[PDB]
Enzyme design. Structure first.
Site, PDB file in Angstrom:
ATOM      1  N   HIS A  83      86.774  21.614  34.548  1.00  0.00           N
ATOM      2  CA  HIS A  83      87.422  20.361  34.157  1.00  0.00           C
ATOM      3  C   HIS A  83      86.405  19.239  34.344  1.00  0.00           C
ATOM      4  CE1 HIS A  83      88.538  20.442  38.510  1.00  0.00           C
ATOM      5  NE2 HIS A  83      88.589  19.125  38.430  1.00  0.00           N
ATOM      6  N   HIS A  85      85.994  16.561  36.365  1.00  0.00           N
ATOM      7  CA  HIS A  85      85.653  15.858  37.591  1.00  0.00           C
ATOM      8  C   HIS A  85      84.231  16.203  38.035  1.00  0.00           C
ATOM      9  CE1 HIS A  85      90.172  15.260  38.766  1.00  0.00           C
ATOM     10  NE2 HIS A  85      89.736  14.322  37.944  1.00  0.00           N
ATOM     11  N   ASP A  87      82.942  17.432  40.689  1.00  0.00           N
ATOM     12  CA  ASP A  87      82.654  18.720  41.307  1.00  0.00           C
ATOM     13  C   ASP A  87      82.553  19.839  40.281  1.00  0.00           C
ATOM     14  OD1 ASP A  87      85.380  18.529  40.747  1.00  0.00           O
ATOM     15  OD2 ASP A  87      85.977  19.740  42.478  1.00  0.00           O
ATOM     16  N   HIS A 148      96.207  20.499  37.732  1.00  0.00           N
ATOM     17  CA  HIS A 148      95.372  19.563  38.480  1.00  0.00           C
ATOM     18  C   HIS A 148      94.815  18.486  37.558  1.00  0.00           C
ATOM     19  CE1 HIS A 148      92.125  18.133  41.144  1.00  0.00           C
ATOM     20  NE2 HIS A 148      91.293  18.368  40.145  1.00  0.00           N
ATOM     21  N   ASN A 179      93.652  15.524  45.442  1.00  0.00           N
ATOM     22  CA  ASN A 179      93.336  14.586  44.369  1.00  0.00           C
ATOM     23  C   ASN A 179      94.231  14.907  43.179  1.00  0.00           C
ATOM     24  OD1 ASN A 179      92.153  12.774  42.585  1.00  0.00           O
ATOM     25  ND2 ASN A 179      90.417  14.127  42.140  1.00  0.00           N
TER      26      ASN A 179
HETATM   27  O1  LIG Z   1      85.878  14.145  42.111  1.00  0.00           O
HETATM   28  C1  LIG Z   1      86.748  13.669  42.863  1.00  0.00           C
HETATM   29  O2  LIG Z   1      87.233  12.511  42.786  1.00  0.00           O
HETATM   30  C2  LIG Z   1      87.289  14.572  43.987  1.00  0.00           C
HETATM   31  C3  LIG Z   1      87.433  14.003  45.245  1.00  0.00           C
HETATM   32  C4  LIG Z   1      87.919  14.721  46.334  1.00  0.00           C
HETATM   33  C5  LIG Z   1      88.277  16.055  46.192  1.00  0.00           C
HETATM   34  C6  LIG Z   1      88.802  16.774  47.376  1.00  0.00           C
HETATM   35  C7  LIG Z   1      89.666  16.168  48.297  1.00  0.00           C
HETATM   36  C8  LIG Z   1      90.158  16.861  49.403  1.00  0.00           C
HETATM   37  C9  LIG Z   1      89.803  18.185  49.618  1.00  0.00           C
HETATM   38  C10 LIG Z   1      88.951  18.804  48.714  1.00  0.00           C
HETATM   39  C11 LIG Z   1      88.458  18.114  47.611  1.00  0.00           C
HETATM   40  C12 LIG Z   1      88.142  16.636  44.926  1.00  0.00           C
HETATM   41  C13 LIG Z   1      87.653  15.921  43.822  1.00  0.00           C
HETATM   42  C14 LIG Z   1      87.536  16.610  42.505  1.00  0.00           C
HETATM   43  S1  LIG Z   1      88.819  17.838  42.240  1.00  0.00           S
HETATM   44 ZN   LIG Z   2      89.306  17.854  39.982  1.00  0.00          ZN
HETATM   45 ZN   LIG Z   3      87.948  19.935  42.756  1.00  0.00          ZN
END
Ligand SMILES: O=C(O)c1ccc(-c2ccccc2)cc1CS
Ligand SMILES: [Zn+2]
Ligand SMILES: [Zn+2]
Ligand SMILES: [Zn+2]
Length: 231
Positions: A83, A85, A87, A148, A179
């Site tokens: 996706h 984002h 990550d 998600h 998120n």
């Molecule tokens: O890209 C982002 O904004 C983002 C920020 C935080 C997480 C997160 C939060 C808590 C635990 C594991 C991951 C994930 C994502 C992308 S899914």
């Molecule tokens: Zn995401």
């Molecule tokens: Zn993620």
């Protein structure tokens, strides 16, 4: 034995062998005060490697490629982002510069562009409708519907019975929605049901963040999503 956030400094990447020819890659990123882990996938493709998702940033993804070269020594020829984002696409520019062909659905590419994120070069056709599946080398790509995010894809490795759920699937230890700014809470349970119906034989289930497990992770995610819905 699975690496945790405590054991990976931001900027390093670990590889974890799930089955023959299938690894996860684990990186960490600092965000909003805390440190979070993130999973991607590596699938052997003959004498090449298929990469699923970046390591959450340019620096992490450069280290990912160096760690793959060091431990596996086969070339990463293609990459799929599941996706839009950071990550999942954060590091696409590093991959592209290294000669990796980067891929995503038109939905993901559009949403990445809107967000100002990095944009995989190639477009994956045939995934626009819920329940759509296409073969991509050694894996199957599946669009379960919005969850998600509206664009999230899951990846299945039939040779190893490995189901990579991405961030549509939560780890067991996570009991609160994370998120969900871009989520479709209303459709998320129905999308998970499509995953369960399509891959009932999966023996390994990889979440986007945290510890792998079995198919239990799907019902767990439904439970968490519904709890958050009734917040
Ligand atoms: O890209 C982002 O904004 C983002 C920020 C935080 C997480 C997160 C939060 C808590 C635990 C594991 C991951 C994930 C994502 C992308 S899914
Ligand atoms: Zn995401
Ligand atoms: Zn993620
Ligand atoms: Zn190309």
């Amino acid at each position: 034995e699975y690496p945790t956030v405590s054991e990976i400094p931001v900027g390093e990447v670990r590889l974890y062998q799930i089955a023959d020819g299938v690894w996860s890659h684990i990186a960490t990123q600092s965000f909003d005060g805390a440190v979070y882990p993130s999973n991607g996938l590596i699938v052997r493709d003959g004498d090449e490697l298929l990469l699923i998702d970046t390591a959450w940033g340019a620096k992490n993804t450069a280290a990912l490629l160096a760690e793959i070269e060091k431990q596996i020594g086969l070339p990463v020829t293609r990459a799929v982002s599941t996706h839009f984002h950071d990550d999942r696409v954060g590091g696409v520019d590093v991959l592209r510069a290294a000669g990796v062909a980067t891929y995503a659905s038109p939905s993901t590419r559009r949403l990445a562009e809107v967000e100002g994120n990095e944009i995989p070069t190639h477009s994956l056709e045939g995934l626009s409708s819920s329940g759509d599946a296409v073969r991509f080398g050694p894996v199957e790509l599946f669009y379960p519907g919005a969850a998600h995010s509206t664009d999230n894809l899951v990846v299945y490795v039939p040779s190893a019975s490995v189901l990579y759920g991405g961030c549509a699937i939560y780890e067991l230890s996570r009991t609160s929605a994370g998120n969900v700014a871009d989520a479709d809470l209303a459709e998320w349970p129905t999308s998970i049901e499509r995953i369960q119906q399509h891959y009932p034989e999966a023996q390994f289930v990889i979440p986007g963040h945290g510890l792998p497990g079995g198919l239990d992770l799907l019902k767990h995610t439904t439970n968490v999503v519904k709890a958050h819905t009734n917040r």
